[PDB]
């Protein structure tokens, strides 16, 4: 009735899922959590988080405006993760996902395997490859 299920699809309340991470209250334990959290930020148009979650070498602040601009063109309709891998030895991780959306009234889906890198206890997004 008054539930606020997380936009990531976890069946958990946002406050207790991706929301505590985007709030800064909780560090993302793994690449999957970060991916989910970034998806929620896209859905909730945060951008500041999307920049904080972007690997520092990418200089995200510089393209903040383009992130905002992107918010207006797409409507997110769902996230489905089908693969996840990570290791402390590599400080690297991967998340394969399908993100469905709508653009100009036309539906579509993204299928990508994103890479995440860890720096000082925190995971950051960096790159991607179409699996």
């Amino acid at each position: 009735k008054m539930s606020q299920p997380c936009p990531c699809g976890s069946a958990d309340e946002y406050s207790l899922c991706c929301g505590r991470i985007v709030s800064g209250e909780r560090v993302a334990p793994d690449p999957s959590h970060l991916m989910r959290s970034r998806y929620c930020a896209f859905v909730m148009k945060d951008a500041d988080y999307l920049i904080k979650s972007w690997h520092p070498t990418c200089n995200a602040a510089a393209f903040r405006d383009d992130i905002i601009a992107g918010f207006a063109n797409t409507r997110w309709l769902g996230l489905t993760i089908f693969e996840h891998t990570w290791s402390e030895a590599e400080n690297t991780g991967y998340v394969s996902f399908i993100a469905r959306f709508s653009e100009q009234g036309k539906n579509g889906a993204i299928i990508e395997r994103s890479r995440f890198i860890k720096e000082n206890g925190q995971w950051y997004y960096i790159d991607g490859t179409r699996p």
Binding site: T80, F82, S96, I98, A109, I111
Partner: peptide
């Protein structure tokens, strides 16, 4: 390719 089990779980194609 597209017809291999769509990881969406639809059971057949990414098209479908």
């Amino acid at each position: 390719g597209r017809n291999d089990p769509c990881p969406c779980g639809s059971g057949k194609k990414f098209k479908k």
